Design a protein around this ligand. Structure first.
Ligand SMILES: *[C@@H]1O[C@H](CO)[C@@H](O[C@@H]2O[C@H](CO)[C@@H](O[C@@H]3O[C@H](CO[C@H]4O[C@H](CO)[C@@H](O)[C@H](O)[C@@H]4O)[C@@H](O)[C@H](O[C@H]4O[C@H](CO)[C@@H](O)[C@H](O)[C@@H]4O)[C@@H]3O)[C@H](O)[C@H]2NC(C)=O)[C@H](O)[C@H]1NC(C)=O
Ligand SMILES: *[C@@H]1O[C@H](CO)[C@@H](O[C@@H]2O[C@H](CO)[C@@H](O[C@@H]3O[C@H](CO)[C@@H](O)[C@H](O)[C@@H]3O)[C@H](O)[C@H]2NC(C)=O)[C@H](O)[C@H]1NC(C)=O
Ligand SMILES: *[C@@H]1O[C@H](CO)[C@@H](O[C@@H]2O[C@H](CO)[C@@H](O[C@@H]3O[C@H](CO)[C@@H](O)[C@H](O)[C@@H]3O)[C@H](O)[C@H]2NC(C)=O)[C@H](O)[C@H]1NC(C)=O
Ligand SMILES: *[C@@H]1O[C@H](CO)[C@@H](O[C@@H]2O[C@H](CO)[C@@H](O[C@@H]3O[C@H](CO)[C@@H](O)[C@H](O)[C@@H]3O)[C@H](O)[C@H]2NC(C)=O)[C@H](O)[C@H]1NC(C)=O
Ligand SMILES: *[C@@H]1O[C@H](CO)[C@@H](O[C@@H]2O[C@H](CO)[C@@H](O[C@@H]3O[C@H](CO)[C@@H](O)[C@H](O)[C@@H]3O)[C@H](O)[C@H]2NC(C)=O)[C@H](O)[C@H]1NC(C)=O
Ligand SMILES: *[C@@H]1O[C@H](CO)[C@@H](O[C@@H]2O[C@H](CO)[C@@H](O[C@@H]3O[C@H](CO)[C@@H](O)[C@H](O)[C@@H]3O)[C@H](O)[C@H]2NC(C)=O)[C@H](O)[C@H]1NC(C)=O
Ligand SMILES: *[C@@H]1O[C@H](CO)[C@@H](O[C@@H]2O[C@H](CO)[C@@H](O[C@@H]3O[C@H](CO)[C@@H](O)[C@H](O)[C@@H]3O)[C@H](O)[C@H]2NC(C)=O)[C@H](O)[C@H]1NC(C)=O
Ligand SMILES: *[C@@H]1O[C@H](CO)[C@@H](O[C@@H]2O[C@H](CO)[C@@H](O)[C@H](O)[C@H]2NC(C)=O)[C@H](O)[C@H]1NC(C)=O
Ligand SMILES: *[C@@H]1O[C@H](CO)[C@@H](O[C@@H]2O[C@H](CO)[C@@H](O)[C@H](O)[C@H]2NC(C)=O)[C@H](O)[C@H]1NC(C)=O
Ligand code: NAG
Ligand code: NAG
Ligand code: NAG
Ligand code: NAG
Ligand code: NAG
Ligand code: NAG
Ligand code: NAG
Ligand code: NAG
Ligand code: NAG
Ligand code: NAG
Ligand code: NAG
Ligand code: NAG
Ligand code: NAG
Ligand code: NAG
Ligand code: NAG
Ligand code: NAG
Ligand code: NAG
Ligand code: NAG
Ligand code: NAG
Lengths: 446, 131, 125, 112, 131, 131, 48, 125
C-alpha cells in the first residue's frame, strides 16, 4: 500500500480558547444600557451534536469573569450622566420620629434638618429630610453626618433609568462557538454525553442577590448539588431547586418624594413627609412549601455524607450587612431581610406563612468596591414585589470526628456564584478547520 | 426532507460521524468563518476572526491549494507517523480523535509540504523555461 | 419541464392485486438527491402517504400498509410501479404519483414540487 | 403520527379584504439539525395540488407575492396579503420530517 | 487618444453600456474595491470594506473560480429563470436590468453552483485516486 | 547543520545576496507578512498590515497567477527598461539595486500585465465557447 | 484633483428627505461643536 | 528503513594506508539536503569527526586530518568510501559511518539520524 498526505479545509475540529463575547437583546430606559448590544436573532438555531462527548468544567470558564466585568462596566457607565452629591456633606441636626411610631420601627427613622445650597451660589436655603438609622452616624437635637462623608461622595441614580433586569443574550463571534450540555442529570464537572451547538445563549436575568437566588432558571427533574470540592468546606455549595416558592415582599410606608434644587440644573430627590401609618418592611413565604423544599434538599444532600448522619441549618455567623442579610432590589428600593427565621431547624434520618423583617438602606456601595458609592432616591408610593426563589448559596462549618449534625450555613458575598448557576451549561471553544489525513492520490504532474 | 438517503446535519453536526462521511460536508464549516470601549471590543473580535481566516488562507496559499478544499500532494506518508490502516481511519474514526493523535506531528508535515511545494515550483519553472 | 403520468385499470374487484404504473418524463428517475412518493386522497378524508422509493433503490412504507404495499423501479424504461394486494372497498380513492425534494449534504430543500393527473381507482363487487 | 390540524375549517372571503389560515402540529417540527420542514399547498376544484410556500417562508417559483407565511415550533400561519376571485380551492399544510407524512384536513375557501 | 476604436471610460462608467461591451471592463471595478470617536468611525468603515471584499472572495473560493474574473461552470441555465434569447441579453440589455430581473433567483443559482463544485471536487478526487 | 551545500539564513537574510541565490528563500519572506487610545493604535497597525497584504494579493489576483510564489507571464521584456544581460542580473546583482533601477518603470509593467491578462481571459473564454 | 465620471444611458431615482447623508452631516456637526467646547472653562461660579 | 553497514580489513599493519567502505540501503546517497559523515570513537579521547562528503560531491576535512584523510563516493552502487594514509598505533579505534541533516533554504535541520554497526579497526603488528 502506497500513501500520500492530504490536507482538507473545513474539517469539524475544535479546541478550548478564550475570547471576548458581546451582548445581544431585543432592544425593547433602565440601568442596563442595551444600546451597544446588536439586535438578536428572532429564532436562534440549535444544532444537536450526536456521537460526541465534551469535557465540561465549571469554576474556570472565562464567561463568568467576562460577564462580571461587563456588568460592572455597564453599571458604571449608567451613573456618569447623573449628578454627584458632593456638597451635601454638612452637619445634620436630627430628631427621632414619633408620629404614630410602632415598637418594631421605633428609633429607625430620623427627621433631619440642615443648611443646603440653592441655585444661586451666593445664597443658602434651610431644608429638612428623613433619613434611616443606617445612613447616619453621630458626631462627638443632636448633630449627625452621613456614613459616606469620610469615605467618598455618592452619586444619586437618575430617576429616568430603572433597575429592571431585562434578559441579555451572549453570542459567539465569527470563528468561535459555544457548546451547551443537554444532559438532564448533568453534574457540576465531568464529561457531558449530550452536547449541542447554539449561536446565542438563553435569556439570562442579571439579578443581583447575595443569599437567596431568585428569578433564575429552575431545574427540570430534580434538585442538584454543585461544589468544586465537597470535602473542602472553604468552597461555597450551590443548590438549584426544581419547583419555585413565592415571596411576597412590600414597603407598607406611603412615603412621598420631594425635589430640592441644590444647584443650576441639578436637583436632589429628598425623602418627603410620610403620610398615613408606618410599618416595618417584611416578606412572606409559605411554611409548607419551604418545609417540603428543605426536605427535598436534605434528601438530595444525604447521599454525599451518609444516611446515618444528621444535618442542621443555622443562621450566618457574622460579617458585613451585605453578607449576613438577603439583599435585593424590587423596583427602586433595596431591601435587607433577616433570613434567621428560615435556616433554623434540625433534621434526623427517616398561620401558613413565615414572616421575616427587612431593613431599608440608601447609601449602598454595590459589589466589593468601597472607593465609590451610589445613592438610591426614594420611590413615591407603596412598593409591592413578588418573585420565585431558585437557589441557595450554602457554606459548611468545620466539623470534628463527631461525623454528625453537619452544620450548614448560607453566605456567598461574591457575585460570580449567582451567574455560575446560569452559565454552568455553556463553554466557549475555537474551531480549527484545517485538517491532515492520508489518501491514495498522488496529484497530477505539469 | 429527511429520509433513508443523504442527511444534511448542521454546523459541526458531522463531528460525531466518521472521517469519510464528515469529508462530504467541508463547505458548511468553511462558509461560516466570516460605549466606545464596546466598539473596541467588537472591532477586536472582528479583526481576530479576519486574521485567523487570512492565516489559514495564507497557509493554503503557500502550498499548491490556494483555491480548493480537497487537494493532493507529492510527499509520501511515513508509516511511523501513524502505522494504521486506511480503511480503519476513514470508516472507524472521527476527526477529533485523529486530530488528537496527529497533533504531535503537525509542524513536521507542514514544513515538508511547504518545502515540497517550493521545490515543485522551481522544477516547473525550470521545465517551462525550455518552451 | 418534468411531466408525470399514471397508468392502470380504472376498476378493480375486491381481494386481488392492484397495479399502478407511473411514467416519468423530462428528468432522470435516478436523480442524485430526490425522492418519489405515491399519495392517495379520498373525499373529505384528505391526503395520506403510502410509501416511497429513494434514489439508492431502497424503499420505506407507512406502518399501516407494510403488509399490503410494494414498490418497484425500472431505470431502463424510466418508470416506477406500485403493487397493492388485498384491496377493499375502503381503498376507493384517487392515486397520485408525486416528486419531492430530499435534503442534500450541503443544503436542505423541502416540499413536493410536482404532482400527477390522478388515476381514480374504483373498488366494487 | 404528527396529526396536522388547521383552523378555521371554512373561510368565505370576497376580493378586496385579507385572509389568514392557522395550522397547528401535535409534534414539534424543529428537526435535530435546526431546520423546519413545513410546507403549504393549494388544490383547486378537480385539479392537482400545487406548492405555494416551502420551508415555512421561502416562496416557490411562479407563486405571486400575495401569499405569505411565518412561524416556528408548533404554531404556523398562512396569511394572504391580497386575494382574488381565482384563489378558490383547498389549502393544506404538510410536514416532511416525521414518517408517515401527513396533511391537514383542508380549509375551504369560497366567495361569501 | 480617443477615437473610433475602443474607449477607456471610467470607474462604473460602463453601466449604461450593454453586457457584451461592459464585460471587458471587469478589472477597473475590481481593482478599486480596496478625536477617539472619529478613529472608531474610520476603522469601522475600513473593517466593513475589508469584510465585504473577503466575503466576495470567499464566495468565489467556494466555487471553482477562486482566481479568475471570468470562468465557466457545468450547471446549465434553466429557462424558467429568464426564458429569453441569448442575443437579446448581451446586445440589448444592461447589467442593472439583468441584475434586477434575476435578483429573486440569485440564491438558488448560488446553491446550485456550490453543490456542483462539491460534487465535482469529490468526483475528481475519486478519479485521481486510481494513480 | 551548516555545510558547504545549502544555507538557511533568516528573515530578510538574502538581501545582500544575488537575485538567483535569493530566489530560493521566497517562502520565508512571505510567511512572515502576517487605555482606549492605545487600543485604537494597535487596531490601526493590525488593519494596515491586513490592507497591505490584501492589496498585494489583489494585485497578484488581477494577473494570471491566482496564488504561487513564482509565476510566468506572456509578454516579452523591453530592453528600454534595463537592456542588461540575463546572467549578469541574476548572478551579479542584488534585489535592492535591481529594484532601484526598475523603480521608474514599475507602473508601465503593472499596466501591461493587466492588459495581457484581460486579453488572454477574453480569448480563452471565446476559445472554450466553441464546444 | 477630484475625479468626476459621467454615466451615459442610465437614470437613478433620487429622493430627498430620506437620504442618510443629511443625518450623518448633522451628527458630525453636533460632535465637532461639542468637542470644540471641551477645553473651555465652565461658568458655574457666576450665578450670583 | 534506512540502514548502514561497514566493511573493510580488520587488522592493518603500521605505516600503510587504511581503507573502509560504508554501504547505504533504503535511501539514495544523492538526497537533495543531507550529508554523510565519518566519526570514530576511542577511550579517553572521545569522538572525532574525520570528515564528510556533501550531496554536491564536495569534501571537507578536519584540520588535524586534512593531510591524511580522503573521501570519495560511488553513486552507481550507492556507497561511499574513505581512505586514510600514514596510519599510526594511536588510530586504533572503532569507526562509525553516519548520516546528518543539512540546513535547507526554507528550514534548518540538525541531527545525526542513523549510525553504522561500528566495525572495530585494530592497528598493530
Ligand atoms: C423578579 O421578577 C418579578 C416578576 O414576577 C419582578 O416583579 C416585577 O417588579 C416590577 C418592579 O421592578 C414591577 O413593575 C412595576 O409595577 C408597578 C405596578 O404594576 C401594576 O400596574 C401595571 C400597569 O402599569 C400592571 O401591568 C402590573 O401587573 C401591576 O398591576 C408599576 O407602577 C411600575 O411602573 C412604574 O415604574 C416604571 C419603572 O420601574 C416606570 O417606567 C413607570 O413609568 C412607572 O413609574 C412598574 O411597572 C412588576 O409589576 C413586577 N411584576 C409582577 C408580576 O408583580 C421582580 O421585580 C423581579 N426581581 C426581583 C428582585 O424580585
Ligand atoms: C452515530 O453512530 C452510529 C453507530 O453507532 C451511526 O449509525 C450507523 O450509521 C451508518 C450509516 O452509514 C450505518 O451504516 C449502514 O448500515 C446499513 C445496515 O447494515 C447498510 O445497509 C448501509 O449500507 C450502511 O452500511 C450503520 O449501520 C449505523 N450503525 C448503527 C449501530 O446504527 C450513526 O449514523 C452515527 N451518527 C452520527 C450523527 O454520527
Ligand atoms: C503527544 O505528546 C503529548 C505530550 O508530549 C503526550 O502526552 C503525554 O503522554 C504521556 C504518556 O505517554 C503522559 O505520561 C504520564 O505518565 C504518568 C507517570 O508514568 C502516568 O501515570 C500517566 O498515566 C501518563 O502516562 C503525559 O502526562 C502526557 N502529557 C504530557 C504533557 O507529557 C502524548 O502521549 C503524545 N501522543 C503520542 C501519540 O505520541
Ligand atoms: C449610449 O447609448 C447610445 C444609443 O444607443 C449608444 O450609441 C450606439 O451604440 C451602439 C452599440 O455600439 C451602436 O450600434 C452599432 O453601431 C455600429 C456603427 O457605428 C454598427 O456597425 C453596429 O452594427 C451597431 O449597429 C449604435 O450605432 C450607436 N448609436 C446609436 C445612435 O444608436 C452609445 O454607445 C451608448 N454609450 C454607452 C457608454 O453606453
Ligand atoms: C421579484 O420579487 C419582487 C418582490 O417579491 C417583485 O416585486 C413586486 O412585483 C409585483 C408584481 O408581480 C408588484 O405588484 C404590483 O401591484 C400593483 C397593485 O396591484 C400593480 O399595480 C403593479 O402593476 C404590480 O403588479 C409589487 O409592487 C412588487 N414589489 C413588492 C415589494 O412586492 C418582483 O416583481 C419579482 N420579480 C420577478 C421577475 O419575479
Ligand atoms: C557576501 O558576498 C560574498 C562574496 O561574493 C559571498 O560569497 C560568495 O558566495 C557564492 C555562493 O552563492 C560563491 O559562489 C560559488 O562559489 C564556489 C566556490 O567554489 C564556486 O564553485 C561556484 O561556482 C560559485 O561561484 C562565491 O564564490 C562567494 N564569493 C567569495 C567566497 O568570495 C557571500 O555568499 C555573500 N553573503 C551574503 C549573505 O550575501
Ligand atoms: C528615476 O527618476 C528619479 C526622479 O524621479 C531620478 O532621480 C534623479 O536623478 C538625477 C540624476 O540622474 C538627480 O539629478 C541631480 O543633478 C544634480 C545637478 O546636476 C547633481 O549634482 C546630482 O548629483 C544629481 O545627479 C536628481 O536629483 C534625482 N532626483 C529627482 C527628484 O529628480 C533617477 O535618476 C531615475 N533613475 C533612472 C534609472 O532613470
Ligand atoms: C420633620 O421636621 C419638620 C421640621 O421640624 C416638620 O415640619 C414642621 O412640622 C410642624 C408640625 O406639623 C409644622 O407646624 C411646621 O410648619 C413644619 N415645617 C417647618 C418648616 O417647621 C415635620 O412635620 C417633621 N416630620 C415628622 C414626620 O416628624
Ligand atoms: C444654618 O445656618 C444658620 C446661619 O449661619 C445657623 O444659624 C445660626 O446658628 C448658630 C449656632 O446654632 C447660632 O449661634 C446663630 O445665632 C444662628 N443664626 C441665625 C441667624 O439663626 C444654623 O444653625 C445652621 N444650621 C441649621 C440646621 O439651620
Ligand atoms: C432615639 O433613637 C435612638 C435609636 O435610633 C435611640 O438610641 C435613642 O434612645 C432615642 N432617643 C429618644 C429620646 O427616644
Ligand atoms: C468612616 O467613619 C466610620 C464611622 O465612624 C468608620 O467606621 C470608618 O472606619 C471611617 N472610615 C475611614 C476611612 O476612616
Ligand atoms: C462530579 O463528578 C466528579 C468526577 O466524577 C466527582 O468527583 C464529583 O463528586 C461529582 N459531583 C457531585 C456533586 O457529586
Ligand atoms: C479536596 O480537599 C481535600 C482536603 O480537604 C484534598 O485532600 C483533596 O485533594 C481535594 N480535592 C479533591 C478532588 O478531593
Ligand atoms: C404577611 O403575613 C402577615 C401575617 O400577619 C400579614 O399581616 C401581612 O399583611 C402579610 N404581607 C403580605 C405582603 O402578604
Ligand atoms: C398613599 O397616599 C396617596 C396620596 O395621594 C393616596 O392617593 C394613596 O391611596 C395612598 N395609598 C395607601 C395604600 O394608603
Ligand atoms: C402572595 O400574593 C399573591 C397575590 O396574587 C397570592 O396569590 C399568594 O398566595 C401570596 N403568597 C403568600 C405566600 O402569601
Ligand atoms: C414539616 O412538616 C411536618 C409535618 O408532617 C412536621 O412534622 C415538621 O416538623 C415540619 N418541619 C418543620 C421544620 O417545621
Ligand atoms: C441511603 O439510603 C438510600 C435509600 O434507602 C439508598 O438508596 C442508598 O444506597 C443509601 N446509602 C448508603 C450509603 O447506605
Ligand atoms: C443570628 O446570628 C447572630 C450572629 O451574631 C447571632 O447573634 C444570633 O443569635 C443569630 N440568631 C439566632 C436566632 O440564633
Ligand atoms: C434576626 O432575628 C433573630 C431572631 O431572634 C435575631 O436574634 C437577630 O438579631 C436578627 N438579626 C439581626 C441582624 O438583627
Ligand atoms: C428556631 O427553631 C426552634 C426549634 O424548636 C424554635 O423553638 C425557635 O423559636 C426558632 N427561632 C426562630 C427565630 O425562628
Ligand atoms: C414563577 O413560577 C411560575 C410557575 O412556574 C411561573 O408561571 C412564573 O412565570 C414564574 N415567575 C418568574 C418571575 O419567573
Ligand atoms: C519515511 O520518512 C522518510 C523521510 O526521512 C521518507 O523518505 C520515506 O519515504 C518515509 N517512508 C515511507 C514508507 O514513506
Ligand atoms: C487492519 O488492521 C488489522 C489489525 O487490527 C489487520 O488484521 C488487518 O489485516 C488490517 N487491514 C489490512 C487491509 O491490512
Ligand atoms: C432545472 O435544471 C436541472 C439541471 O439541468 C434539470 O434537470 C431540470 O429538468 C431543470 N428544470 C426545469 C424546469 O427546466
Ligand atoms: C427571441 O425570443 C422570442 C420568444 O422566445 C422569439 O419569438 C424570437 O424569435 C426570438 N428571437 C431570436 C432572434 O431568436
Ligand atoms: C518590446 O515590446 C514590444 C511591444 O510590441 C514587443 O513586441 C517586443 O517583443 C518587446 N521586446 C522584445 C524584443 O521581446
Ligand atoms: C554581458 O555584458 C558584458 C559586459 O559588457 C559583455 O562583455 C558580454 O558580451 C555580455 N553578454 C554575455 C552573454 O555575457
Amino acid at each position: 500500500e502506497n500513501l500520500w498526505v492530504t490536507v482538507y479545509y473545513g474539517v469539524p475540529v475544535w479546541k478550548d480558547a478564550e475570547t471576548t463575547l458581546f451582548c445581544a437583546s431585543d432592544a425593547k430606559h433602565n440601568v442596563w444600557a442595551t444600546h451597544a448590544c446588536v439586535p438578536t436573532d428572532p429564532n436562534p438555531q440549535e444544532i444537536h451534536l450526536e456521537n460526541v462527548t465534551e469535557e465540561f468544567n465549571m469554576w474556570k470558564n472565562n464567561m463568568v469573569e467576562q460577564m462580571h466585568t461587563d456588568i460592572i462596566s455597564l453599571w458604571d457607565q449608567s451613573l456618569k450622566p447623573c449628578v454627584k452629591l458632593t456638597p451635601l456633606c454638612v452637619t445634620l441636626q436630627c430628631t427621632n420620629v414619633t408620629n404614630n411610631i410602632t415598637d418594631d420601627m421605633r428609633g429607625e427613622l430620623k427627621n433631619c434638618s440642615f443648611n443646603m445650597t440653592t441655585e444661586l451660589r451666593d445664597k443658602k436655603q434651610k431644608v429638612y429630610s428623613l433619613f434611616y438609622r443606617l445612613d447616619v452616624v453621630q458626631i462627638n437635637n443632636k448633630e449627625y453626618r452621613l456614613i459616606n462623608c469620610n469615605t467618598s461622595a455618592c452619586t444619586q441614580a437618575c430617576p429616568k433609568v430603572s433597575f429592571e433586569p431585562i434578559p441579555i443574550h451572549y453570542c459567539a463571534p465569527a470563528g468561535f462557538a459555544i457548546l451547551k450540555c443537554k444532559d438532564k442529570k448533568f453534574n457540576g464537572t465531568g464529561p457531558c454525553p449530550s452536547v449541542s451547538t447554539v449561536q446565542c445563549t438563553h435569556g439570562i436575568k442579571p439579578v443581583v442577590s447575595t443569599q437567596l437566588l431568585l428569578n433564575g432558571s429552575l431545574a427540570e427533574e430534580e434538585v442538584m448539588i454543585r461544589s468544586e470540592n465537597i470535602t473542602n468546606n472553604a468552597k461555597n455549595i450551590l443548590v438549584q431547586f426544581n419547583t419555585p416558592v413565592q415571596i411576597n415582599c412590600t414597603r407598607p410606608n406611603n412615603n412621598t418624594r420631594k425635589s430640592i434644587r441644590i444647584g443650576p440644573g441639578q436637583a436632589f430627590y429628598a425623602t418627603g413627609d410620610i403620610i398615613g401609618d408606618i410599618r416595618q418592611a417584611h416578606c412572606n413565604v409559605s411554611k409548607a412549601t419551604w418545609n417540603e423544599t428543605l426536605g427535598k434538599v436534605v434528601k438530595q444532600l444525604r447521599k454525599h455524607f451518609g444516611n446515618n448522619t444528621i444535618i442542621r441549618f443555622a443562621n450566618s455567623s457574622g460579617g458585613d450587612l451585605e453578607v449576613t442579610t438577603h439583599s435585593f432590589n424590587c423596583g427602586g428600593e433595596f431591601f435587607y431581610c433577616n433570613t434567621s427565621g428560615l435556616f433554623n431547624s434540625t433534621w434526623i434520618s427517616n398561620n401558613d406563612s413565615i414572616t421575616l423583617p427587612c431593613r431599608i438602606k440608601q447609601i449602598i456601595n454595590m459589589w466589593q468596591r468601597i472607593g465609590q458609592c451610589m445613592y438610591a432616591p426614594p420611590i413615591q408610593g407603596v412598593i409591592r414585589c413578588v418573585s420565585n426563589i431558585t437557589g441557595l448559596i450554602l457554606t459548611r462549618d468545620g466539623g470534628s470526628t463527631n461525623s454528625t449534625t453537619e452544620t450548614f450555613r448560607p453566605g456567598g458575598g461574591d457575585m460570580r456564584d449567582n451567574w455560575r448557576s446560569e452559565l454552568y451549561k455553556y463553554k466557549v471553544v475555537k474551531i480549527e478547520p484545517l485538517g491532515v489525513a492520508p489518501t491514495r492520490c498522488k496529484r497530477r504532474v505539469v | 426532507a429527511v429520509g433513508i438517503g443523504a442527511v444534511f446535519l448542521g454546523f459541526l453536526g458531522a463531528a460525531g460521524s466518521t472521517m469519510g462521511a464528515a469529508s462530504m460536508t467541508l463547505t458548511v464549516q468553511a462558509r461560516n468563518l466570516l460605549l466606545t470601549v464596546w466598539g473596541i471590543k467588537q472591532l477586536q473580535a472582528r479583526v481576530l476572526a479576519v486574521e485567523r481566516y487570512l492565516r489559514d488562507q495564507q497557509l493554503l496559499g503557500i502550498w499548491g491549494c490556494s483555491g480548493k478544499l480537497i487537494c493532493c500532494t507529492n510527499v509520501p506518508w511515513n508509516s511511523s507517523w501513524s502505522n494504521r490502516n486506511l480503511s480503519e481511519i476513514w470508516d472507524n474514526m472521527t476527526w477529533l480523535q485523529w486530530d488528537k493523535e496527529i497533533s504531535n506531528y503537525t509542524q513536521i508535515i507542514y514544513g515538508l509540504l511547504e518545502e515540497s511545494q517550493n521545490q515543485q515550483e522551481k522544477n516547473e519553472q525550470d521545465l517551462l523555461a525550455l518552451d | 419541464q418534468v411531466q408525470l403520468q399514471e397508468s392502470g385499470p380504472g376498476l378493480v374487484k375486491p381481494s386481488e392485486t392492484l397495479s399502478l404504473t407511473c411514467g416519468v418524463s423530462g428528468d432522470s428517475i435516478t436523480r442524485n438527491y430526490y425522492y418519489w412518493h405515491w399519495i392517495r386522497q379520498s373525499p373529505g378524508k384528505g391526503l395520506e402517504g403510502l410509501g416511497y422509493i429513494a434514489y439508492t433503490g431502497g424503499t420505506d412504507y407507512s406502518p399501516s400498509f407494510k403488509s399490503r404495499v410494494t414498490i418497484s423501479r425500472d431505470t431502463s424504461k424510466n418508470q416506477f410501479s406500485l403493487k397493492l394486494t388485498s384491496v377493499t372497498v375502503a381503498d376507493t380513492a384517487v392515486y397520485f404519483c408525486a416528486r419531492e425534494r430530499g435534503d442534500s449534504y450541503i443544503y436542505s430543500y423541502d416540499g413536493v414540487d410536482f404532482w400527477g393527473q390522478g388515476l381514480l381507482v374504483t373498488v366494487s363487487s | 403520527d404528527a396529526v396536522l390540524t388547521q383552523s378555521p375549517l371554512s373561510l368565505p372571503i370576497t376580493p378586496g379584504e385579507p385572509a389568514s389560515i392557522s395550522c397547528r402540529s401535535s409534534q414539534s417540527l424543529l428537526h435535530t439539525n435546526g431546520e423546519t420542514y413545513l410546507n403549504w399547498y393549494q388544490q383547486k376544484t378537480g385539479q392537482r395540488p400545487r406548492l405555494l410556500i416551502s420551508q415555512v417562508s421561502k416562496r416557490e417559483i411562479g407563486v405571486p407575492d400575495r401569499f405569505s407565511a411565518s412561524g416556528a415550533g408548533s404554531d404556523f400561519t398562512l396569511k394572504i396579503s391580497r386575494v382574488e376571485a381565482e384563489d378558490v380551492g383547498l389549502y393544506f399544510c404538510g410536514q416532511g420530517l416525521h414518517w408517515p407524512r401527513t396533511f391537514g384536513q383542508g380549509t375551504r375557501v369560497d366567495i361569501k
